[PDB]
Design an enzyme around this catalytic site. Structure first.
Site, PDB file in Angstrom:
ATOM      1  CG  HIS A  25      -0.252   4.112  13.875  1.00 15.68           C
ATOM      2  ND1 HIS A  25      -0.801   2.850  13.333  1.00 15.68           N
ATOM      3  CD2 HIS A  25      -1.181   4.847  13.613  1.00 15.68           C
ATOM      4  CE1 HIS A  25      -1.727   2.984  12.759  1.00 15.68           C
ATOM      5  NE2 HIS A  25      -1.974   4.421  12.936  1.00 15.68           N
ATOM      6  CG  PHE A  31       2.896   3.491   8.521  1.00 14.92           C
ATOM      7  CD1 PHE A  31       2.355   3.063   9.465  1.00 14.92           C
ATOM      8  CD2 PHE A  31       3.375   5.044   8.756  1.00 14.92           C
ATOM      9  CE1 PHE A  31       1.860   3.711  10.577  1.00 14.92           C
ATOM     10  CE2 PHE A  31       2.827   5.671   9.883  1.00 14.92           C
ATOM     11  CZ  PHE A  31       2.134   4.750  10.694  1.00 14.92           C
ATOM     12  CG  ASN A  63      -2.076  -0.464  15.376  1.00 14.67           C
ATOM     13  OD1 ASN A  63      -3.244  -0.073  14.941  1.00 14.67           O
ATOM     14  ND2 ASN A  63      -1.227   0.733  15.814  1.00 14.67           N
ATOM     15  CG  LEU A 102      -0.959   8.687  11.328  1.00  9.31           C
ATOM     16  CD1 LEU A 102      -0.156   7.699  10.373  1.00  9.31           C
ATOM     17  CD2 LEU A 102      -2.287   7.664  11.292  1.00  9.31           C
ATOM     18  CD  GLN A 160      -0.091  -0.715   5.871  1.00  9.70           C
ATOM     19  OE1 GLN A 160      -0.428  -1.697   6.482  1.00  9.70           O
ATOM     20  NE2 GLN A 160      -0.817   0.492   5.490  1.00  9.70           N
ATOM     21  NE  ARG A 179      -3.377   2.382   3.129  1.00 11.81           N
ATOM     22  CZ  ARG A 179      -2.977   3.215   3.800  1.00 11.81           C
ATOM     23  NH1 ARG A 179      -1.493   2.894   4.448  1.00 11.81           N
ATOM     24  NH2 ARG A 179      -3.570   4.417   3.848  1.00 11.81           N
ATOM     25  CG  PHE A 230      -0.699  11.000   3.180  1.00 10.34           C
ATOM     26  CD1 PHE A 230      -1.291  11.083   2.240  1.00 10.34           C
ATOM     27  CD2 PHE A 230      -0.814  11.897   4.059  1.00 10.34           C
ATOM     28  CE1 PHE A 230      -2.290  12.343   1.696  1.00 10.34           C
ATOM     29  CE2 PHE A 230      -1.691  13.232   3.825  1.00 10.34           C
ATOM     30  CZ  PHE A 230      -2.297  13.168   2.770  1.00 10.34           C
TER      31      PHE A 230
END
Length: 168
Positions: free
Chosen positions: A126, A113, A102, A122, A63, A55, A60
């Site tokens: 995370h 990521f 997660n 975030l 991942q 991903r 951004f």
């Protein structure tokens, strides 16, 4: 102790982009750093080598870490179970931050990521555990193969990975 350093050799459709290296903040999150380090060396007989970034969201993050199902549904920690959020001391301060994916609190496995921007929304969701040292431009090149839904236009693979035993 000086913090440990991991590397990933990255390919795009099997052509080398080069090497990305990360400092792992073992001085702040030792259990989380050790899981990522051991998965990177292959010393447990499984781990990140040959897995891909499934991903990639331009602007951004990239991942990866799903070495069992390759799509965000798999991966496993070195601890035999999903493990707790060790702390939230460190924040998502900018490009290069390495943080755990997660599925909610206390569900860390192997997915992670790499941020390509500051992602303060975030923080506290995370566990931040490392940061790119060398190779940020490779992560920027990776980010360009992504798309709004995360699908990649080239296969972005960890062709090799391990620990750098000296730091210079």
């Amino acid at each position: 102790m000086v913090n440990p350093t991991v590397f990933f050799d990255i390919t795009a459709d099997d052509e080398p982009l080069g090497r990305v290296s990360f400092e792992l903040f073992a001085d702040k999150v030792p259990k989380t750093a050790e899981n990522f380090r051991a998965l990177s060396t292959g010393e447990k007989g499984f781990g990140y080598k040959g897995s891909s970034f499934h991903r990639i969201i331009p602007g951004f993050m990239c991942q990866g870490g799903d070495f069992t199902r390759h799509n965000g549904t798999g991966g496993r920690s070195i601890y035999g179970e999903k493990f707790e959020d060790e702390n939230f001391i460190l924040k998502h301060t900018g490009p290069g931050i390495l943080s755990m994916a997660n599925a909610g609190p206390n569900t860390n496995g192997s997915q992670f990521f790499i941020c390509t921007a500051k992602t303060e929304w975030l923080d506290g969701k995370h566990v931040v555990f490392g940061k790119v040292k060398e190779g940020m431009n490779i992560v920027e090149a990776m980010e360009r193969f992504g798309s709004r839904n995360g699908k990649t236009s080239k296969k972005i693979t960890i062709s090799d990975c391990g620990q750098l035993l000296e730091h210079h």
